Symmetry: D2
Subunit: 317 residues, 4 copies
Amino acid sequence: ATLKEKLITPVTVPSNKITVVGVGQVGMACAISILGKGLCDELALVDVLEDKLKGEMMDLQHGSLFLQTHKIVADKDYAVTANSKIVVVTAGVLVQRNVNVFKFIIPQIVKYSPNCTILVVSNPVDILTYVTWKLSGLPKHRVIGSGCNLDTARFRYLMAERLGIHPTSCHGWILGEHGDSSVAVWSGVNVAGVSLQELNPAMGTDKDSENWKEVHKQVVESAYEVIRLKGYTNWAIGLSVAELCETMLKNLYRVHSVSTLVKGTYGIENDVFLSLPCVLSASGLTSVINQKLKDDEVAQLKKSADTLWSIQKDLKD
Amino acid sequence: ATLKEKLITPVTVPSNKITVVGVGQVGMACAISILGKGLCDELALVDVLEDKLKGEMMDLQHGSLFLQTHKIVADKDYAVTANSKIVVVTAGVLVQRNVNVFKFIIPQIVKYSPNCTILVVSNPVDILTYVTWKLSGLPKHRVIGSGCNLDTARFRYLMAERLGIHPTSCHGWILGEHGDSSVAVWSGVNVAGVSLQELNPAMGTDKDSENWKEVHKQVVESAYEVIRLKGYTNWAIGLSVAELCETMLKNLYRVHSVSTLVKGTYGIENDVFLSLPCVLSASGLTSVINQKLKDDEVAQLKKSADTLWSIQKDLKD
Amino acid sequence: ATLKEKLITPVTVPSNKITVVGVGQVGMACAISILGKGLCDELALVDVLEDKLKGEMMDLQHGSLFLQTHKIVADKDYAVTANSKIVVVTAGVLVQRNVNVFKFIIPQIVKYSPNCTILVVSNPVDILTYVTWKLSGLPKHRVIGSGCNLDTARFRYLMAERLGIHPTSCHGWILGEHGDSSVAVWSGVNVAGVSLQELNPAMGTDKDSENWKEVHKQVVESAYEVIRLKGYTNWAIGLSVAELCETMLKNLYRVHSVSTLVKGTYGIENDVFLSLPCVLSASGLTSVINQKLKDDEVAQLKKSADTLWSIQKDLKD
Amino acid sequence: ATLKEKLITPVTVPSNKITVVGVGQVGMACAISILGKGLCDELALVDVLEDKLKGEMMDLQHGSLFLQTHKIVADKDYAVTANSKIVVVTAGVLVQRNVNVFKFIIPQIVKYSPNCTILVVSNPVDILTYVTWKLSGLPKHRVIGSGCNLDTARFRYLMAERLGIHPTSCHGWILGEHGDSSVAVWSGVNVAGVSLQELNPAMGTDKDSENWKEVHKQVVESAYEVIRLKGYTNWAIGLSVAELCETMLKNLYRVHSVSTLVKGTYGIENDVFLSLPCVLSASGLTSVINQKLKDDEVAQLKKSADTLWSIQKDLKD
């Protein structure tokens, strides 16, 4: 009178589980990229909506044949979040408004899944990373935001498109705040270990032949030019998050530039999360790479650190 | 005075190129799934919109660091479509309205890329597959629609969820029209080569203990219940298309149930594209699996074939 | 005076760790397949040789740039085995000789890594699976051998090559002992849910047009015909093991035919590991699929079960 | 009276085909890595042995269930080689002995597959790359050897292990001849865009605290220390080749350091293949990165170029 009884003779817990907070344009970009990489053994989704959340879950589950993920669960309560190895926080609705949400969600994240690494994808990323470090009570190394990871990704595609090579080949970084105030360190930009700064001194300046400073002006401009055209950017930031979840889940110790506490380095006493190249692993951020910067470059960190803390002093937690 | 000149000393054509027609909810689901599998060596996007198309391209290109795809191009003209190995047609706006678009696009698809396989993702899939076979002048085997591939995928997730196993293990099929009129062949449903029909005869009927006929009623119902909640289904049908592009590009000879001409089998003289298990390869559809069906099951094909052709007779090409 | 101090500012445990026991022809096939799939976050290797083991480790580590695995460790002591999520036992040198090795290794496996699933790859697989269940003190569901998984794989490639389709499409199984005595269940053999037994009754017999019974005679023959030509088979059984480690690590609940205790089903009171389709997950074997067999087919299990226990009664543990 | 006739109703050419020349320790490392990445839509194997070749083919084909490759063919005649997109030449048995084989094979490679890129894996790689450019009549850009690609890979694993990070993060190169005479360019070595040479000047020298010059001494030493222990290195060089076949097949334009003609740069008039960072694509080598080297470093290229041509002058083709 039953198939399951007659067919399947019995001889759980999440393993690599990842939770994505929010089903929005960018939160379902991260999920389908995380599932497209087969990182998570369970994918939990949580958002304040009752139905779309259930519709995003069912639309993914119907593709479970095509996925390496077994259990895809989504609820509006954070019970599903339990046992999450990483919690990707895309939830966002101006900081003190977002701090209304993160008071509302982040401590629910941590009640059910204490070990989780919290990756903060939502803009503003640098402050909402502090917001989520304050009120989650997780260590410094278990709460990090996406940050300039995607900026570094956009920067390498641009730096490659001008050279025609593949973005993985052209290595250059973006540090600092996520506005016009990001630091593109040209001392590290290079291809095949051939420094570009070395050969052409005109880089990192006001003017140059190709005015390569336009690249960093295009890096910060393209983010919006994608926002202009289709209304907001998702699959760029969802591929970046999936690549971070890969570093942490697969425990690779890869260097991503992510938002972490800058207190103690680059002349900053304030508790501020600013994007710095960091070695990510299963445990959290394992370390930070120490970036040798021009006095002028450390200045942009220092100043832009203050721009955050100047408006991060009035946060009401 | 130039990096590219000084750095890169010179010592093209698309290879696996895939074009996706449309940037809509489901057309960018297919792209990011195709890119997430690294199938296409070039991904061309085309849609009637000037800007979102340019925004979907740039949002993908910014993730090129994270992708195995080198060139992602998008234009509103079909010059980009040139040399496409597969053209995934998601464009859709009721058939004779869609046949306005496919007159407008499909012959532009074929002008630039004559060898392309045309995969038709758009609803109605069975008729718009005929529409695109009529006016493209491609062989029967190079024009196929998605069809019940995703229905078969939803059907296996359901058939597995009731058994708790993984959808790849539970093998069952969906043939025929894409409405309530799909044929779930229970003679093939099984797990680990254990036929479910064999053990419980009550399957495929009006009533059963678990009333397993509800599965096929849930297969056709879930498609809408995803449409209800979030407004439309994308990442299920985009993972299905990416799995079809994989069969054809990687030239696997895998059996998918896709929309192909049923003239000559199952008592149908009409030229009608109805979903049948077919062996897909690089060349196109290589063949069809011959499905042994109940008289009653061949009837649903036969009748539902007529439901198509009854309204496929008045098509104005 | 140090790069590491100046460069990397500090802000462990194995996660998915897999241990492969033995570096032999088949044990390095499993490793490079497991690493080629990026399953293990750490790969531990252990074998009785001091140097080749260190050479197999270094030859893999030099490819770490190309791998998704971070730490590849190999020692002759089983300290490295610690925290293994799965222990793949390829060690083998006739059962009571192999039981000399498994007394020597298997309890060292379990001292350092109590939670490990033990996958037994080594021939004889069915008995050395019992040998390793007796003396490891692990549950029934955490000790399983490869078994007819690869037989099922060879069987599907053959069953497909005759049909020209891709082996993933043609579903047919191999149960029982690993000699000529395997059970190819033809009641489950099919393609696209079209039973082959159904249409041609001459299958599973003495004679047929194509004498499809030759397939199962070729399945058991090819294993040796690979052993004849190059001396032994590795990358077939290493891809099979990597696909098992994937089911268990990725926690997929996929159905593989593996060696598990048959006590209680198919009329067997003896404690005997015989290859049966089983649902594998992170926890172990989750269940067994109940295979509906001809009286004659249950007989081959029953008899071949005794052939094992007849020589499994004199095992000295 | 036939399954294939009754089941499969008909509705070819290699696409991405790769040929590996030789089944030896390193030639089956490349195959199982190429198949493990699903690069080739057909894999052709060729070697001078009748049986092992047939045994290597069958051992791979039995794993076809687990592979994304459909057709794996192996013959001793080069008919199978036809339509190869890349031909990986592992065949080797001292140059003028190897030039006996490449007279015997390389023109058979090119008779059946004129468009093929020829990747030369076999030691000596730099000369046997010239040997195969002379007698194949392919362009400069379609014949390249593995070269210091794997040296660069070993160099990054070492450079990372000292830093604890993941080898993909630490970017440093190996140019030139494949002996002790390789050039480790320290001007490019760095992590997260932080030059190591910049901070510690003692690098690239006779003595340093960690004497980081030992890394390049370990890079060249480890190659042999793997050769010592297990007799020869395979899965390092097979993962490197699979990563080259990926750059070329997937048409990525990635920068690998491979053996190409150095005539015209670094003060070399001779026709000599020496390892230089090069942008690989579908067409061949697309270009070369221009490496800014110390006078002393250009010297090692210049001199080691002569060491090749001094014994490359007496080649009898």
